[PDB]
Amino acid sequence: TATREVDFTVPDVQKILDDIKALAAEQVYKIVKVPSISFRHIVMQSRDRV
C-alpha cells in the first residue's frame, strides 16, 4: 500500500546548490577583434548613388 505513488515532500538541497554553483560560471560577454557590421549598401545600376 505504501510506495504506490512517488512523493516529492523532501526536496534535494544539494542539487539546488550544485545548480547555483554551475550557474555561477556563466559568461555573458565576448571578446572580439572587430565589431559587427551595422550598415550595408545595395548597389543599383547607378555609379554614384547607393
Partner: protein, 48 residues
C-alpha cells in the same frame, strides 16, 4: 561508518543519477561482462 542504525518504513523517490548511466564506463563494464560470458559459452560449445 556508524552502527547506531534504526529503520522505519519504505518509500519511493525519483532518481537523481538517472542520466549518468549512458557514460562510457558503464558501457565498458557491461560489454566486458557480456564478453566473458561469450567466451565461456564458446569454450563449452567447443569442448562438449
Amino acid at each position: 561508518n556508524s552502527k547506531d542504525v534504526f529503520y522505519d518504513k519504505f518509500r519511493t523517490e525519483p532518481n537523481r543519477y538517472k542520466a549518468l548511466f549512458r557514460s562510457s564506463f558503464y558501457n565498458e563494464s557491461r560489454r566486458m561482462n557480456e564478453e566473458k560470458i561469450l567466451e565461456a559459452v564458446k569454450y563449452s560449445q567447443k569442448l562438449g
